[PDB]
């Protein structure tokens, strides 16, 4: 059950502050080693994920270029990466097959453009 990753979740910016998120980040929960894996053309991140009251978190160890996430995109990425760590809960509305990233009572990111 717990070992199926390398599954490209194209991250989606929902909230207005994340509209600057880069070209395209690939999110993949590594359920095989149980770690967060977030990588793209220019970023390489591992993390360990923990749960608190349904909030999915992840302490990251990302290595990443500057310029490829421009400046505000990198900010977007810090924003996104801080979200998980603050406790992002996967869930939303009108979805049954796609993952959505929400924290502070609203979705600001998604895995795949399901909705």
């Amino acid at each position: 059950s717990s070992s199926n990753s390398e599954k490209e979740w194209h991250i989606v910016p929902v909230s207005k502050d994340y509209f600057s998120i880069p070209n395209d980040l690939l999110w993949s929960f590594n359920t095989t080693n149980k770690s967060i894996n977030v990588y793209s053309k220019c970023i390489s991140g591992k993390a360990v994920y923990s749960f608190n009251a349904g909030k999915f978190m992840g302490n990251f160890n990302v290595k990443e270029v500057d310029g490829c996430f421009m400046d505000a995109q990198k900010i977007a990425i810090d924003k996104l990466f801080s979200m998980l760590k603050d406790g992002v809960v996967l869930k939303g509305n009108k979805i049954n097959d796609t993952i959505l990233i929400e924290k502070d009572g609203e979705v600001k990111l998604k895995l795949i453009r399901g909705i």
């Binding site: 199926n4 929960f29 994920y49 749960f51 999915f56 809960v89 509305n93």
Partner: peptide, 18 residues
């Protein structure tokens, strides 16, 4: 379990390993 869920590792991977 839910619209998306994944509030538990098991329920998370049960949803990922689909």
């Amino acid at each position: 379990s839910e619209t998306t869920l994944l509030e538990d590792e098991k329920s998370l991977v049960s949803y990922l390993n689909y």
